[PDB]
Symmetry: D2
Subunit: 137 residues, 4 copies
């Protein structure tokens, strides 16, 4: 007998530890919120300081930042990043993100208040854009 055969599994040991090292848990958690949940958003703007609370069935996310001051958040796929928001125009902010660890597409986001009373969030990865459009409750 050599390796040739039809093999059936009797034991699978410690896969959760391997998935944890690979960051799969962080990706799953993040996509559960971002891709698979309908969000509701609460913003408190005090000058150029922002509180943004994103509520979903599975997670409530709160970020706090001041325009022009570096802060930490997660990318849309859950990776920790340093973020810096700047005004692009009077009604549009742009956030550049840098990964704390590893490599990946260049990610960013924008938030704009439109003339039609809408809030527009864009999220970019290497020039591919996702758009979310919100109206006041």
């Amino acid at each position: 007998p050599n390796f040739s055969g039809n093999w059936k599994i009797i034991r699978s040991e410690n896969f959760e530890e391997l998935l944890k090292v690979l960051g799969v848990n962080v990706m799953l958690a993040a996509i559960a919120v971002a891709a698979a949940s309908k969000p509701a958003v609460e913003i408190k703007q005090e000058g150029d300081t922002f509180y943004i609370k994103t509520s979903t069935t599975v997670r409530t996310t709160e970020i706090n930042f001041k325009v022009g001051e570096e802060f930490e958040e997660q990318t849309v796929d859950g990776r920790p990043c340093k973020s810096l928001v700047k005004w692009e125009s009077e009604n549009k902010m742009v956030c550049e993100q840098k990964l704390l660890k590893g490599e990946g597409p260049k990610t960013s986001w924008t938030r704009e208040l439109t003339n039609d009373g809408e809030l527009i969030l864009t999220m970019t990865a290497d020039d591919v854009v996702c758009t979310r459009v919100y109206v006041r409750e």
Copy 2:
């Protein structure tokens, strides 16, 4: 007549997140992130038949509490709400039968045993299939 034949390229995809949320895909993904993809650490406080279990992972800390012999609500490993009832099988082993609050699925259960060697054994069952987790005290 209209001919759907072609090589089609996508220009827009709208509101998929709403569809996945009605389908419960968010709840399942979140639950699998914790159960399948995270190394857990477990804190138990037992006072007689009353249990507090805190399960810590990178992505979630879960706290449950129950009394042996009293129905309570928890979630299945895939995140479905269930009614649970724990009974002693023996002095050192508790068994939990689960019933879904909504819908149908595999029969699920769990057991927790404290061995004579001071190991904690969790089993989780779905129909014919059993998963085992073994823990030691820090």
Copy 3:
């Protein structure tokens, strides 16, 4: 009496993949990899009421076929096996009702429409909630 109290550290986790398979978690993850997380390209061949639809993504190429007015088996958008029946709503629009082969869930359906502007519109519904995808020819 046995005391389960402690700070427990995991040493072994055995056979979780079996449990996830019985729970259908694999089928959900595979389906969401394609539907939620991939940009699709779609090839259609229509021969009267018979359709061949090939969906190409980074992770999978899928082929389905059906005949309008004949019950067939496919998967829901979240991967659950279903019985499907497509009917013409108009010359330009087909509508598909789905029924799960096992278990319960939101009522799912899809429609495919060819517009006068040469667009293909896919809608997917679950209970009150609609996702729309729009395609043009290459």
Copy 4:
């Protein structure tokens, strides 16, 4: 002013973003590796191997010769170059190098035991998962 309670009306093209991010690759790979019970067919012809891993969601086929670089995927679906060597008469070891990007150092081993078992190990940065098989 951005202050308010905002309700979503449209979410557009998230699938395109997730595809750029490789989330599809990771989901597909874990559907097979973590969430499926595998069945494995091996054909060993000299030191040439065909390994077919069958699951509910995917059948995967690799072909390699011991000592010759080939391409496969890591456990989380990333394309890699692989090289298998004999560590011992009954145990092969495979080192992997990502084609693109950065990640944990990954490897796998396959062993035939004297008790008739097949043992697969898969490692990422010194964290090991083990699969044990017997002949059908």
